Homo-oligomer: A and B are copies of this chain.
């Protein structure tokens, strides 16, 4: 019976989110196919000791900790197969600037942009060429939209506090979607809506709250969406699964984000996207294991 390590780790929030991911997996893995080995990482490199007996690492990780590529690099070196994209692909997909460069070279639609450095200053020369308004995002991955001349400036200050690196994009307003890819096949598309929500007990107001529905899109747009989301997957060297976040504007989808390590809880987008296609959660984990195994073998 194949020993499946369920890998959890990170710090603070991400650790929480990782644990909640790991517990969902640990509960839904077929116990007849698998021997389940929950693994909780105190420190990242404690992974080598723990991984010493398991036959596969099913990554429950979330955030930079599972996206930077170290864990994948480490697992490769121990010769343990593991789920999801590899080190180079994880790393690239977590870098917004490098990602967009590889995307534009393929002529895949993504908003024009500019990169900004903590130490460096912005030559207004290249900046204002994309004009207004703008969105400022950290390069490694909140949102600040900037309408005016002075608008931009105020943000970089605090974004540079946190991220040594920032991307400034021209702001496209359109209809948001997310496209999960599993093993080169596009799963059902999900549309993301924003609606204001009031919480009486905490007395909280939120407009950033999300509503996600599976809606069949016009077959014309559905084609142009599936083309692009599979092109990203290919171009960024993703494997076994990925989530492409997109923005549709006047008929044309633009790539907003590429997630090599998307939410794996049952309310997460990719597990919903799959379920709509008739793949229930427990089987989803089977596919991730079997496709990951095959992919790792091709790699080496």
Contact = CB atoms under 8 A, between A and B. Distances in A.
Interface of A: 43-45, 48, 68-70, 73-74, 76-78, 87-88, 91-92, 95, 98, 101-102, 104-105, 118-119, 164, 237, 298-300
A69 B44 contact: no
3 closest A-B pairs by beta carbon, nearest first, are A70-B73, A101-B105, A88-B91
A102 B235 CA distance: 12
A300 to B, nearest CB: 6
Contact of A48 (B45, B92, B164, B299): B45
B74 A68 contact: no
Contacts of A118: 298
A87 B104 contact: no
Q: Which of A45, A76, A164 has the most chain B CB atoms closer than 10 A to its own CB?
A: A45
Contacts of A98: 88, 92, 102, 237
Contacts of A77: 43-45, 70
B102 A91 contact: no
Contacts of A45: 48, 74, 77-78
A87 B78 contact: no
Contact of A70 (B87, B164, B298, B299): B87
A164 B239 CA distance: 14
7 contacts: A87-B87, A91-B92, A92-B92, A92-B98, A101-B101, A119-B298, A164-B300
Contacts of A105: 101-102, 104-105
A74 B45 CA distance: 7
A117 B114 CA distance: 32
A297 to B, nearest CB: 11
A77 B71 CA distance: 10
B92 A68 contact: no
Nearest to A49: B48
A73 B68 contact: yes
A70 B74 CA distance: 6
Contacts of A70: 70, 73-74, 76-77, 87
A70 B95 CA distance: 17
A57 to B, nearest CB: 14
Contacts of A299: 164
A76 B71 CA distance: 12
Contacts of A104: 105
Nearest to A70: B73
Given A164-B298, A164-B299, A298-B164, A68 B48 contact: no
